[PDB]
Amino acid sequence: VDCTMYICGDSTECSNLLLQYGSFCTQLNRALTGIAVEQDKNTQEVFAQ
Amino acid sequence: PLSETKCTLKSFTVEKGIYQTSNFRVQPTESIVRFPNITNLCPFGEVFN
Numbered sequence: 001v002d003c004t005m006y007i008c009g010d011s012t013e014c015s016n017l018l019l020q021y022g023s024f025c026t027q028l029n030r031a032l033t034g035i036a037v038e039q040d041k042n043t044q045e046v047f048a049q
Numbered sequence: 050p051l052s053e054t055k056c057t058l059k060s061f062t063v064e065k066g067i068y069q070t071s072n073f074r075v076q077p078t079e080s081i082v083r084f085p086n087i088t089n090l091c092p093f094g095e096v097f098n
C-alpha cells in the first residue's frame with residue numbers, strides 16, 4: 001500500500017500535511033512489506049524442502 | 050536510484066537486496082477545461098438593485 005498515494009493521492013498540499021504527521025506511513029510501508037516478504041518465507045519453508 | 054535508496058534507508062551504505070522506493074507516476078501533460086458555453090449572464094443586478 002503506497003501510503004502517500006492512499007491518503008494524499010495527486011495532491012501536493014495533502015502530501016505536505018502528512019509529513020507533519022511524522023513517519024507513520026513509513027511503518028505502514030514497512031509492515032506490509034514485512035508481511036509480503038514473510039509470504040515468500042512461508043512458501044519456501046513448506047515447498048522448498 | 051541507488052542514492053534514492055540511500056535517501057530512503059537513511060544510511061550511507063545499502064546491503065544486497067531489493068528495496069521499495071517512492072512510486073513513479075506520469076504527470077499531466079497539459080490542462081483541459083470543459084464548460085457548457087452559455088450566453089446569458091446571471092441576474093445579480095436584479096437580485097441586488
Ligand SMILES: *[C@@H]1O[C@H](CO)[C@@H](O)[C@H](O)[C@H]1NC(C)=O
Binds near residue numbers: 085086087
Ligand atoms: C458549446 O459549443 C458547441 C459548439 O462549439 C455547441 O455545439 C454546444 O451546444 C455548446 N454548449 C452549450 C451548452 O450550448
